[PDB]
Design a protein around this ligand. Structure first.
Ligand SMILES: C[As](C)(=O)[O-]
Ligand SMILES: C[As](C)(=O)[O-]
Ligand SMILES: [Mg+2]
Ligand SMILES: [Mg+2]
Ligand SMILES: [Mg+2]
Ligand SMILES: [Mg+2]
Lengths: 168, 178, 168, 178
RNA sequence: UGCGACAGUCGGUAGCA
RNA sequence: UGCGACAGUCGGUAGCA
């Protein structure tokens, strides 16, 4: 049940990196983060991943548990980001603004450790949103750990932050 | 407001409807969502292509949902069907893809699709050039049409200067360049 | 007719580079070199190319006219060199020694600008062969130009060098 | 001379014969050439695998040349056929590939093939490990069997220390290492 | 040599180290 | 900033620049 809980958006290209072997795009990490929200009684969750991650794992962009991506798409949870090769090289469309544009227009929250310095500048109205709605995380081997104070000690609880109606 | 500053728009429906509904299902709903996006943007010239054999009742091997959405768009001079027929029990298809390209090319418009049409880029060089710079990709979020704000790489144009023929709408850039 | 002419071995991985856009593996170059020998009345010609060149053209190892390779294999002229990915990375088997080992055991000549510094050292008996049997080349846009004095002015003519029985 | 210092040898004939003759043709000649190479090297343990349906006369859709070479190698306890049969007009194949692997594994030998057996590496991890370090590839020059002198990368062993069980045969290396 | 550490070309992650 | 020129990881061609 979505008892007053918020839409959720995840920067998968950030999570998978920060989960295992930092240099590796470990899809498992995406799984662990998701399963956490699921077990937390969430319904609306969306992940973003540039599409060229389906491309077979090279040594220059290593990736593990690749089959997890298509499996999450099947549940209308994972969403790929437009990618293609123009003149033999790659065009990406910069997924970063997809994560925000979605969350902004849905009045949700972002799961990522990237501060989006570039986009805070591109649109002041976005800056405010990024300032108040970015949820960071820390990975410990095989457990999703978000902070109990997503903003500073001056900020709100974890439940009053991921819920639109606080329980006061 | 003026629509003459806008570019013609062509949509690969057989790509949209697939990518909207559980991939293996031809969900016409998406086509409606994609179009309405352009409409709200002040659009007049919009054209969709769909191989005609989709009017056939939803079979178990080629499932389709909300089938009646098609006739409503043809009635609006927006959807256009592509020739199909049965020769000796098989289907003739005429490959809708090149209808999408030929038109957008001949109208100097843009194509909406996630298919790169690699096969057609090779057959005609001038087409390749056009597809490279005039293909608009998208991403569907359940019931939300999301095109990229940078249809080409960061070095390329805005979504509006690419989706509009007069690109001179005031630009704002930073950085000292070479 | 093979009127006393020698077996021919070509370092394709060297030719294709040196033909067009030095940084590009231009298969056309292989074609031009071959066609030259063909028009010269040659029968035994063999080219070597590590197999991973069939892999689609990346920006990091660009290659053009890729379909020319399989087309030359069909004529029992092109030969691929064993390649595979062990642990996600590439193993190559170092084609260089295939070109020599073949030419040595066939008493032919090598077409390449590489001096094989490493192999002259690995086997002295090979060094002698490399010294006397390496034919260099120079590419001018779309024409195969070998030297009329494959060795120094002190050395032999082009025909007496690519033919085992000299015409004296 | 001693052959006990040698490793068991297994050959994927359906890969060799193909790659020798015009790819689409099953040229048994190659198998002979490949084997004789090992023989001249002082070999005793050599074993080949071939799906049995190759004894069927050369059909136009599955061409084969020098078919009689097969029986001669079976007669020599070198070639071994792999189970095949026709169920209801179709063929049952039993997938010769895993016969090659299981044996070489169980004999602690090496495999001669250009197929990486990716599918089998996944089914059994211990096999993957073995295939990575025990697959010997080759290259055919018309009528010449050429295996690499470095079956693994330059960092790996010689062709002989990989093709022999006792690797200690005097080594000569240069370079100061870490 | 010694094949790297580097010289050109180029990709993934970093917003200054 | 400014995204590069660079910092880590890494590939193709070079035998010393
Ligand atoms: C191994 As050295 C000191 O010649 O670069
Ligand atoms: C563009 As600058 C001088 O801040 O590196
Ligand atoms: Mg990013
Ligand atoms: Mg199509
Ligand atoms: Mg080389
Ligand atoms: Mg096989």
């Amino acid at each position: 049940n979505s008892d007053n809980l918020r839409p959720v958006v995840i920067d998968g290209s950030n999570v998978a990196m920060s989960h295992g072997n930092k240099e590796e795009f470990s899809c498992r990490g995406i799984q662990l983060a998701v399963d956490w929200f699921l077990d937390k009684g969430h319904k609306d969750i969306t992940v973003f991943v540039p599409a060229w991650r389906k491309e077979q794992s090279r040594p220059d962009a290593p990736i593990t548990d690749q089959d997890i991506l298509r499996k999450l798409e099947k549940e209308k949870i994972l969403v790929f980001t437009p990618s293609r090769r123009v003149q033999g090289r790659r065009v990406v469309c910069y997924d970063d603004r997809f994560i925000v544009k979605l969350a902004f227009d849905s009045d949700g929250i972002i799961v990522s450790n990237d501060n989006y310095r570039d986009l805070q500048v591109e649109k002041p109205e976005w800056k405010k949103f990024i300032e108040e709605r970015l949820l960071m995380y820390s990975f410990v081997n095989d457990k999703f750990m978000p902070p109990d104070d997503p903003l500073g000690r001056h900020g709100p609880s974890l439940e009053n932050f991921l819920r639109k109606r606080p329980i006061v």
